[PDB]
Design a protein around this nucleic acid. Structure first.
Lengths: 62, 61
DNA sequence: CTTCATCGCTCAGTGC
DNA sequence: GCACTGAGCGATGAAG
């Protein structure tokens, strides 16, 4: 039939759906890494310059 | 006859929900990364004499 | 005249 | 009895 057109197209759909899914996971990991670094940074700065409205000059992101 | 239409609707909903999630997390990633940059910045201006890349290494991105 | 990336419809399972 | 989703199949819209 069009066996080869179909194998190619099936490979392509599996590629692109995997692409979006891993990109979503990737963001979730970047968010994770970031929020953790963020708390470390924020607490260290609150420690060091305790006369600064840190959580106001850089409000937390959700 | 009907399972067909209702299934079409749910498949629309699935593609959308997941695009919404990809967007939401796409955004949270940028928000936290900019916040990370400004915190390193402000710590480097308030505690300049101090090494933040060995207390709190950057995670690439 | 390829070659590829998305995505919409459908079907078959998969968890309410 | 049902909503959700992984996946195949054709469009469709580029890219060369």
């Amino acid at each position: 039939m069009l066996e080869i057109k179909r194998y190619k197209n099936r490979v392509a759909s599996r590629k692109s759906r995997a692409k979006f899914k891993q990109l979503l996971q990737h963001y979730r990991e970047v968010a994770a890494a970031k929020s953790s670094e963020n708390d470390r940074l924020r607490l260290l700065l609150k420690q060091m310059c305790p006369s600064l409205d840190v959580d106001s000059i850089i409000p937390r992101t959700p």
